[model samples]
Target: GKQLTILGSTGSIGCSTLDVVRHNPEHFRVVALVAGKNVTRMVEQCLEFSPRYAVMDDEASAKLLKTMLQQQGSRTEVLSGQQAACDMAALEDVDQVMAAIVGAAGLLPTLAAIRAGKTILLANKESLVTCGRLFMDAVKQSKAQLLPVDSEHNAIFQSLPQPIQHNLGYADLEQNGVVSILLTGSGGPFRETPLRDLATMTPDQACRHPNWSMGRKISVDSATMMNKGLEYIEARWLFNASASQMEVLIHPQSVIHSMVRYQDGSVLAQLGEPDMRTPIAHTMAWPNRVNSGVKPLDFCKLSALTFAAPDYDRYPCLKLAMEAFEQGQAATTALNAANEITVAAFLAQQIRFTDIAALNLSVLEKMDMREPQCVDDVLSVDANAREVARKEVMRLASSA
Candidate 1:
């Protein structure tokens, strides 16, 4: 059995990962669980799984979890602060690290796991979006195994050949009879909404994802199709794909997660019900298969799957992310930070949905764009961008 530490154990991906472990007890063991301020859920997890370590990024939350564990006579050691989480990732006993901590906060710990040469199941897209060059370089240097957990990236990983499954750098796709990668998305909730109505769409309306059940931030990203754009940035680093080697398509049904094309006029795709555990289980037992508790897709009863090209006018945030990717690491980091701020503001009802793209565009346009050669440069740019985005959010709110 492999030992695992799940970062962001209270979030959607983390919970789904735990679900996979629940069904496959003999194949894996819980070593550590790290999360943010969700002490209630963290305590439940600690009491149930009895992991050796439970860490919270907030000191107060950690203290509370510790007291709770002690009261229940649980043997889990409670640790606090970001450094503890990073340390847990590099633990020798932890064979696999689930990098599911959402946003740029996940970058350092995920990097630590990579540096430790641990097998990493990557669910955080911001790590690659912010510092693709640095992250990939570390993966190569440490010879770490990086498995994709995001549905789209995981689909692409499965579609590739066995020898080239884990690392794209090891095999030349052209030499292996591979062509372009077809990245698929559901086009989000606003795909068919009247253009004029988008400006007034509420947070609850925007977050109502049609296919997948995700966290609020990701759900909003789906609404703007920025989720797919961020995935595009990740796919570049994950597959060593060039701009010309990947195509984005709107698959409303979302049954076809993603596809890979070959020069011989054949396309291979990974299809399943919209469940995160399928990918989780796939990565958990690579070179073999296991039950993920996800039901099989009934192909005969399925509705017709449709595809269309993305409209930049309808999803300006998606277009902004692509443009930022082309600009450099600084632009990508800035865009990620700015989008986080704007998304939060929109969810709080302080800004309209349409203002998200505008705020991100303004932040990107005014940022000190450059090639960030190190993690420090990337984080500095991220902080600066967040500050600018905060000001933009206030300005937009005041104007509204």
Candidate 2:
């Protein structure tokens, strides 16, 4: 049996993790869970999983859940605040950790889990985008196992040859035949939407992903191809590969999660319907395969699969991400924090669609990027960069 600590317990990935746990009750147990602003849903999860500790960001809402749990005569402890989540992540009860809290906000606690030597299933791409080197270095020092939970990374993780050898000195993983990884995207819902009309995008319209059900921010990232950009950064760090070793291919079929090309003229691809649980389960049961409650990929759906290179001119976020990866240090942290703010501004109708990347890039350029050494440095950089983004976001929206 496995004891798990799941962050972002009220979010998409957290819900999916619970679903897997719910299915295999005897195989998994939740020791801790964390969330923000969804006390009602958290209560439902608390009742089912009965974790040793549960956390929320908002005090008043957490109190409400506490009262609800108390009224039900539950012994499970309730915690509220940021530190609680990180503390719970490093607790001795947790053997496996699901780092699902999206954005740079998830970085510290996920790193804490690494410090605790827990087997970390990484779903939050922003964590890597923000502090890839620090986090990966910690993993090496602490001897914590890091597994990729995103479909693209999971596909890459699975496509590699068995025995899972590493060549950290050269930052090369595939010495056999694999030369590069080809990450697939759904091309978002706006693939054919005109660039001129992007200014008229609504929150609902941007959140309407053609494939893959995700949270609002991620869906918007998908629509803007920023999600793929973040994934690019993640793949770069997670696989110890450079920006040149990865390519983003727009696969509208949503069948091919990700592909790898070998130097010997062979290609390998991981195919599945775009479901978060599949990757979640794959990472959780590493060195083994488990049912993620998903059906097999039906290649013969009376149709054809297509692939094309992304339009970087239109989706400038992809290029910005590549630039951030090359810039290194705290640059990617600014890239992620600024992108989050810009996306929030767009969702709030404060900014236009194109302005998201534009503002993010501007903020990244403006960031006083220092070498982030520890959790505090990363957090401080994220805060400062987000502030820079918010200021620009306000300026851009004022004249709109």
Candidate 3:
């Protein structure tokens, strides 16, 4: 059994992880749980898991949780503030850290887990999308076992050769007979929406993901296909894949998950039910198969699976992402920051769905493109890009 620290315990990935822990008590122990501003759920989790540490990034929420736990005579220690989350990940007792905190906010603690040389289950793709080179370099220097927790990357990890699967930071795909990594996405809810209706699509419509239930931010990314784009960037670093070696396919069934192609006319695919627990359980029990509690795929009951290429006009954010990846790391960092701000604005109904791409591109075009040498530098660019994107939002909102 391994002791694990779960970051973003209140989020979907975190809750699913706890569900895995709930089922297989013999394989894993929840050493610590970290969340953001979800005291009610966090309290519920703490009561059940009874982790040694329960950390909240929001101070007021942490204080309230501490009082509640004390009154209930719970032994779990409550921690407040952001640094505590990072510290908990680096704790020597934690054999593995599930870095599931969403968006760019997850970067630091995940980095700390890598620095601490803990086995890292990386569900947060924004960390790599924002700081690909730096994050991979750190993994190499620390010799931390970095495992992909995203279904797509995790599937790719499974389909790779054993040697390449173990050393993602320094993998030779060609030597292993790997020709290409086929990244698959569900094409979101707007895959067939008339092009004209896209501009007026509501946040509710975008968030209504057909296959996977995700957070609002990621759901929005899926609608725009920007999530796939961000995943593209993350896959690049995780597999050491060049742009030519990576291909994105639109798979509506969500059953295949992802696939890998070999030079010898062979392709390998990982198929499973649409459940986050499968990937979480796979990473948690590396080199060992464990029950994930996910239903097995019923091939006889399934319809025909379909695939297609993404339309650049419909998903301008995706086009921009590919362009940004080609430009440099600074461009990807800026695009990620800008998209976060724009997606928030769109969710709030302050901007049109189509406006998300417009604002993201505007921010990328205007922001300074100096390559970031360190995490702080990348963060600086990210913050500045957000500021620029926010201003663009205001400009467009006022004009609208």
Candidate 4:
């Protein structure tokens, strides 16, 4: 059995990853489970898996979970705070680390997993978004096995040749017959809403995704197509893709998760029920087969798939993504940080739905930091941008 450590164990990806583990207990065994502030759910999860370690975000959550876990006749050790989370990721016995923590907060632990040379199943886009080249360089230096867990990136990974699949972040795409990576998106909830009505869209309206239900933060990301932009930012390094080699298309149905275009003209796509389980399981047992508990896609039941080129006027959120990617790590990191603050502000109704892109652009313009040289530099860059983003949000809120 493969020994595992799951970060953000109470999140959607974490819950789904456990379900996959439940279905194939003989193939995988968990070494540790890490979570945010969710003590109640952590209690249930630690009880269910009985992993050697249960890590909470702070001492308060840790002490509470520790008491209940110990009272129930379990020998699980509970640890608290970010340092503990990184320690678990670096644990020698853990073979694979699931980098599933939601935002920039997940950066350090996931980076620790990379430095430890553990096989990393990456569900956290912010790790790449905030660190970019620095993140991939660590993988190459440590020889860590990096696998994509997002539906789109996992699909692109699935479509890659065997050798390229193994050597992520440094693969020779054109030499291996790969032409371009066609990253796909569900143009979002507002893809069809009239331009004049975009500002009128409420957090509630944005929360209702046409294809998949997700955490409220990510739900609004798709509403502005900001999520796709982040994905574009991630794919550039994931595939070592050049500016011309990466493309995004609007797939309204989202039935086809993503595709890879080859030089010989065969474009391979990985399609499944628009569920995270499939992608999560694929990354969990890469180069091996395991059941994700998600049923197979019934082609007849899905609506007719459609594709169209996205208009930048409608999805300016995505435009800033490409712009930042071209600027270098500092801009991309700032973009990722600003999106988190601005998106949260929108969800809180402090800013208009349309203000996400505007605020994101504002943060990018104001962020004049030099490129990050280390993880510490990355954190400082992230903090600076987030503060500026909140200020932008304040201005937007008061002006209204």
Candidate 5:
């Protein structure tokens, strides 16, 4: 059994991972669980998993969990703050760390897990998007095994050769006879919505997805196809893929999560039910197999699987992310931060959905474009762009 440390244990991915663990109890052990502020669920999870440590984002939550655990007679020690979360990732007893935390919050601990040389099941998109170079460099230096948990990326990971799987993030794809990576997305809920009406679409309309249910931020991202854009950035680091070596296709069905092309005219696709547990189980039982409890996909009942290349007019955010990737890490980090602010503003109804729907060319062009020399540099750039975007959001709202 592999001793595991699960970061972001209260969220969707975290819950899905726990479900997989539940179905395969004998093969995995929970050593530590980390959450942001969900004290109720954290207490329930700690009492059930009986993990050696339960880490909270704040001291108040830690004290609450501890008090609850004491009354319940469980021996779980409660700790809090970001440092404790990072410490749990690098724990000696933990063989694998579920790096499932979202956004900037998860970056440090996931990086810590990478630095500690532990097997990491990475679901945090920002880790790769913002710090791909620094994190992958650390993986090589620390000899850590970083596995992708995003359904698209994991499908791509599975479609590749067994030998290259071990060398993740730095694989010589050309040398391994791999030609290109085909990344697929669901084209989101508005795939068929008239382009002229997109500007009038509300946040609720954006949040509604026809294929996969995701958190609001990413749900809105999927609507703009920015989710695919960020994942595109993720693939660049994960596979060391050049722009020409990668292609993004709109696979409306999501049955084919992602695919890989070869020199000999073969393309391999990993298809599965739209469940996060399948990838969670794959990474947990790597070089082996485990029952993740995801039902086998039934081809007979499937929808018509369609594919198309996205148009820039509709998916400017996606294009922005790609352009930012090429420009530099600073660009990607800055764009990501700006997109978050704009997206959140739209979600709150302060800005018209289309205000963010169309990217003003001045947004990225006028910003300070430079390479992030370190993690702090990336943070500074993220914060820097966020405030600038904030002002833009306020201005956009004032105009509305």
Candidate 6:
């Protein structure tokens, strides 16, 4: 049986991973599960999988879960805090790791998995976005198999001609490299809504993705194209290509996850129904195919698939993402930090939709971001950006 550890067991990606594991119980075992919150679901997962370890964000909730599980005569140990989660990633029993934890919080443990030399199925784009060079260096030094779990990245991974010659840092296709990749987007629910009306855009409306189901924060990111922007940054670092060479096409259909254009004028595309399970399954199996219980793409039903250039004027977050990529480590951290606060505020209706980009830009410009010398430096920069973002939130709140 394959021993697996899931870092974000309560999120959408975690639930989907569990669903896949549920269908293939004999082939995989859950060794450790970590969750941000939702203790009830975490408890349910512990009871079902009976993992060796379970972690929660809060210590009280971990104690509660431990007490609850102990009554049921389960041997699963309850561990709390981020450090526990990080240690769990490098546990001896875990052969493969599902780095599904979202945002910067995921960076350390995912890196731990690499240090452990386990096959890492990555869903946390921020990990790479915040610490691209550091993470890539770890993968190389440790010999961990890093398989991207995002649909676009996974599609590009699958479309690679050969795994041995594939290196994300190398972009030239003729020199044993993968050429340009077009990361597709559905353009989100607010795509057609006029920019002037963005101030009134509600969280419920923003969270409603046109083609894919995901966590609310991510859903909002998709709406504003911040998700796409981060993905663009991710692709740049994942494949080691320049920002100018990568293009983001608003493919509304989301059927074609991503496309790779080679030196020979040949393009390879991976098309599937808009489902995360396909990519999750791909990462879980790795060079092997497995049934993810998702239906095949009905091209007839899709009718006509079309692509259009994304509007950077209206979607400033997308533009900011590109700018962030250009800024390198310090700027990228500020971008993520400001956007996280801004997006949360937007969802809370504390700020306008346009404010998300505005706030990100404000923080990015105001802060004197220096190149991070180490992991602690990255965390320091992240903290500084978040503090500034909080202040910006209050400033916006006061004016309104």
TM-score of each: 0.95, 0.91, 0.95, 0.97, 0.97, 0.92
Please identify which of the two predictions, 1 or 2, would achieve the higher TM-score against the true structure.
1
lDDT of 2 by residue, 120-167 (tens): 888877668777888888887887888888888888888876544232
The digit string of per-residue lDDT tens for model 3 on 66-121 reads 99999888899999887999999999889999999976779899999999999999
lDDT computed for candidate 3: 0.91
Positional deviation of 271 in candidate 6, in angstroms? 1.5
When sorted by TM-score, best at the front, the candidate numbers are 5, 4, 3, 1, 6, 2
In candidate 6, what are the lDDT values of residues 143-201, reduced to their tens digit?
77888999899998787767532344443444655457778888889788887887788
Off by more than 4 A, model 5: 357-361
- Writing each residue's lDDT as its tens digit, candidate 4 over 93-137 gives 999999999777898999999999999999888788878799899
Tens digits of per-residue lDDT, candidate 1, 1-400, equal 9999999999989999999999999998999999999999998988889899999999999998999899999999999999999999999989999999977789889999999999999988877899898988998889889899998999999999876785654456777788888999899999988898999999999999866676898899999988888999888888878788889999999989999998999999999987889999999998789999999999998879999999999999878878887897898889889999999999999999999999999998888766898888888999999999999999877875
Root-mean-square deviation per candidate: 1.8, 2.5, 1.7, 1.3, 1.3, 2.2
Stretches of candidate 3 exceeding 4 Å from the true structure = none
Pairs in clash, predicted candidate 4: none
User: Could you tell me the TM-score of candidate 4?
Assistant: 0.97
Model 5, span 1-400: residue lDDT tens: 8999999999988999999889988999999999999999998898778999999987898888889999999999999999999999999878999999978999999988998999999999889899988899999899899889999889999999986799997779999999999999888888888888888899999998876666888899998988899999999999889999999999888899999999999999999988889999999999788999999999999999889999878887788888889888888888888888888998998776667745433457658757887788889888888888888877766774
lDDT of 1 at 230: 91
> In model 4, what lDDT does residue 287 have?
89
Deviation (Å) of 175 in candidate 3? 1.2
Candidate 2 error regions (>4 Å): 165-171, 174-176, 194-204
